[PDB]
Every structure is written in structure tokens, then in C-alpha cells.
């Protein structure tokens, strides 16, 4: 567990070679260079890797129960093998958002930090939003955020262009507003039909 | 020296074949067709070529001490050999701005006409604005205009995507405002570290 405060030149953290059941690595980037490429690599342990709001973090856990934290910007997450938790603590934009490359059965998606108004669903909330043969990503977003999230934030999801997306609606109108509504990309078609919301924590089934 | 008033159909001025130490050509386009492509070519002389605010002027001096004038729109400047002066008399937008293709040691950049509030630096003002490995042009602009230009306009510069940019901040907030803040593109990496501001006139060192 490495305290990293004030080490702001760091653009590559590579703990990938580390080895035990639980040789657990903790790291938090102190980088504040706007628009930086930062690479964070975990090891065999149950690692805890946090990026920077400033940065386009590529975060990769190894084996084991990794926690990858989103803070802002265009981030690329890969928890390798094991029950990884993708802890989403920022809203992002419509362009600067987190892509999770390898979301699979067992991995979790912790949305506690985007419950702007209240606290998410809590059900098994799992019928995909379906739109027309030529609906745009913009359209699918607007469709997903159609409801009222002013008093209570809601989760929805869809599949566009070969990738899977999750949304948090925290707004009035049927516009997905870049500011307070949130999108999360997941590489590939992953069916979240049967998957359930723990507290505000989605466990993939 | 050709008086050109009222010759508004002119889209190609080609004085390129002209020959002496100082066979000096003066031209000013009278063209007012919105969104026109106008081509202005100088000769061996110390030429004085002005475009149109209306137009996307390609201006090219030959040999000798050419003065190329920016008035508005998407302009492409090439002062050839010699101590050329790129006289910037308009602010432009964030899309319609001047690109200077061949800025080199000896060429000048006359910014007297964009000193909206007061009069520029006057120092040798020369540390490049640096941002992250994947900072956007939008980000670099906002970064460059971060300061307060309300009482006194300030110059800054950066290098994005293989080209060099110069900025004049004439505004309050850290938004580069398209209207009153100004950007100038220079093809290639040109280091303006050591280069100095005359009056409001930057001489490349
Ligand atoms: Ca690991
Ligand atoms: Ca980040
Ligand atoms: Ca893992
Ligand atoms: Ca995994
Ligand atoms: Ca959280
Ligand atoms: Ca809404
Ligand atoms: Ca010439
Ligand atoms: Ca022009
Ligand atoms: Ca020339
Ligand atoms: Ca020259
Ligand atoms: Ca001037
Ligand atoms: Ca400003």
C-alpha cells in the first residue's frame, strides 16, 4: 500500500509483476496534468487502483479481486481474472467517460458515487432499452434518460454498435444532460437482463 | 502598386513571375463573396498583399520582405524566403483563423491589430504552455487563455498535434472565447522560447 501524495510527474505505475494470493497493491495517482495519459497496472493481489480526474487513465488489475476507481476523463478499465469491482465515483461527460473492456460474470459495478438524487433501483432491473434499426448513440442516450431523475436517480442500459452501455438519469427532461446524467461503456455485448442491484452495486450474472 | 477598388470578381491574383531586388507588388482584394477561395501570389519584390475578411485567402509572397495581411476567415499564409511580416489585423474565430505555413527564423508576427485591451507583453515571453499526452486543441486553448485579459491583453503559445499555435487573451474567464480571444496556427514545431516581442511584434529567433 503506497502513499503517493504530491508525486505529480507519475504517468506509469506498473505493479504487474507482483505475485501472492494476496500481495495487495494500493495506489492513487497524484497527477494533475490536464489531458494526460496515465497507465496503472495491478498484480496478482486484490489491488486498489485509483486514477486522476485530470487524466485519461488506463487501469489494469491482474488476477484477484481488484477495485478500479473512476474519477473523471476518458478512462479504460480492465480488471483481469477474478471478481473485480468497478467503482464509479464520477459522472464524466458524453465524450469523457469510462470504458470497461472485459466486464464478465462475477464483476461488479459500484454506482454509489453517482446516486446524485437519492439511491439507485435496488431491484434486478434488467430489460434492455430497445430502439430502431438505425437509432443513434445520441438517441439511445436520450431514450435511456427519458424519465424523471430529479427526486430519485434511475439506472437503465442498452446495446449500441456492438458495445453495451449503462446510464444514470438524475434529470428532469428526456435529454441526457452531459453534466449530471452519466454513461458507462462496456466493450462487447454483455447481457445485464438477469443481473441485480445490491445496494447501488450491480453484480454481473 | 495596383489600385483594385471595386474589382470584386477577382479570385486569382498571380504576380508570382515578377523579378527585381525590389519590383514590389501591392495588392488588396476587393472580393466580398462570402466563403470565397481567393489566391494571392507575390513576386521577387518586397510585396504587400492583403486579403478580404469575406474570404478564405491563400496568400504567398515570393523572395523578399513580404507583408501578408489577415482580415478574417480561413486564411493560408506562406511568406517565402526573406524577413516576412505576418500582419494580423483581425481576431478570427476558433474555426476561421490564419494558418502560417512556413514561419522561420527572421519572420515577424505583427499583433498590433489584436491588442484589444492595451498593448501586448513587450518582453521575450517564451515558455510554451504544456499539457498532457492527449490534451485536446480545445483544452490547450482554454489553458492558454486562463489568465485575465480585461485590462491588458496577453500572449501565450503551445504545440498541439505537430503544429504550433499563438494566442491573445483579451478576456476574463479561463474560456478561450471565440469572439475576442485570438488563435494563430503555425504549421510544424517552431520553438518560440527565445523569440521576443518588439512593440507588439514578435521576431522569430
Ligand atoms: Ca490484481
Ligand atoms: Ca481519470
Ligand atoms: Ca482482476
Ligand atoms: Ca474480471
Ligand atoms: Ca463509490
Ligand atoms: Ca431525465
Ligand atoms: Ca515577394
Ligand atoms: Ca481573409
Ligand atoms: Ca518572402
Ligand atoms: Ca520568410
Ligand atoms: Ca497591424
Ligand atoms: Ca481569459
Amino acid at each position: 500500500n503506497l502513499t503517493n501524495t504530491g508525486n505529480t510527474a507519475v504517468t506509469s505505475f506498473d505493479a504487474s509483476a507482483v505475485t501472492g494470493t494476496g500481495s495487495a497493491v494500493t495506489f492513487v495517482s497524484a497527477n494533475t496534468t490536464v489531458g494526460e495519459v496515465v497507465t496503472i497496472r495491478g498484480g496478482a493481489g486484490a489491488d486498489s487502483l485509483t486514477g486522476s480526474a485530470t487524466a485519461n487513465d488506463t487501469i489494469i488489475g491482474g488476477a484477484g479481486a481488484d477495485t478500479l476507481v473512476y474519477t473523471g476523463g476518458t478512462d479504460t478499465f480492465t480488471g483481469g481474472t477474478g471478481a473485480d469491482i468497478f467503482d464509479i465515483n464520477a459522472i464524466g461527460t458524453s465524450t469523457a467517460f469510462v470504458t470497461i473492456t472485459d466486464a464478465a460474470v462475477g464483476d461488479k459495478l459500484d454506482l454509489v458515487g453517482i446516486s446524485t438524487n437519492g439511491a439507485i433501483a435496488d431491484g434486478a432491473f434488467g430489460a434492455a432499452v430497445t430502439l430502431g434499426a438505425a437509432a443513434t448513440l445520441a438517441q439511445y442516450l436520450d431514450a435511456a434518460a427519458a424519465g424523471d431523475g430529479s427526486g430519485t436517480s434511475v439506472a437503465k442500459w442498452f446495446q449500441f454498435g456492438g458495445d453495451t452501455y449503462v446510464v444514470v438519469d438524475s434529470s428532469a427532461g428526456a435529454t441526457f444532460v452531459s453534466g449530471a446524467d452519466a454513461v458507462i461503456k462496456l466493450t462487447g455485448l454483455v447481457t445485464l437482463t438477469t443481473s441485480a442491484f445490491a445496494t447501488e452495486v450491480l453484480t454481473l450474472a
Side-chain angles (χ1 to χ4, degrees), chain A residues 53-135:
Chain A
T54 221
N56 290 355
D57 310 279
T58 306
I59 309 180
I60 290 141
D66 300 301
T67 300
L68 283 62
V69 192
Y70 184 63
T71 32
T74 305
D75 286 1
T76 304
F77 286 6
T78 304
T81 76
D84 304 292
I85 136 178
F86 304 102
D87 186 352
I88 316 302
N89 280 337
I91 318 84
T93 76
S94 333
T95 343
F97 56 67
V98 48
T99 303
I100 299 166
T101 83
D102 68 356
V105 59
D107 296 320
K108 302 167 166 131
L109 179 69
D110 189 299
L111 308 195
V112 175
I114 48 181
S115 95
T116 322
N117 305 123
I120 275 152
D122 208 28
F125 267 63
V129 166
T130 267
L131 295 187

Side-chain angles (χ1 to χ4, degrees), chain A residues 122-179:
Chain A
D122 208 28
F125 267 63
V129 166
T130 267
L131 295 187
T136 62
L137 170 67
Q139 277 174 320
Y140 266 113
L141 287 158
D142 284 325
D148 192 37
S150 290
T152 208
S153 292
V154 213
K156 297 276 185 165
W157 69 290
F158 58 90
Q159 305 193 335
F160 175 66
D163 310 297
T164 312
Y165 299 69
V166 173
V167 174
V168 174
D169 189 1
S170 294
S171 301
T175 314
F176 184 107
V177 286
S178 193

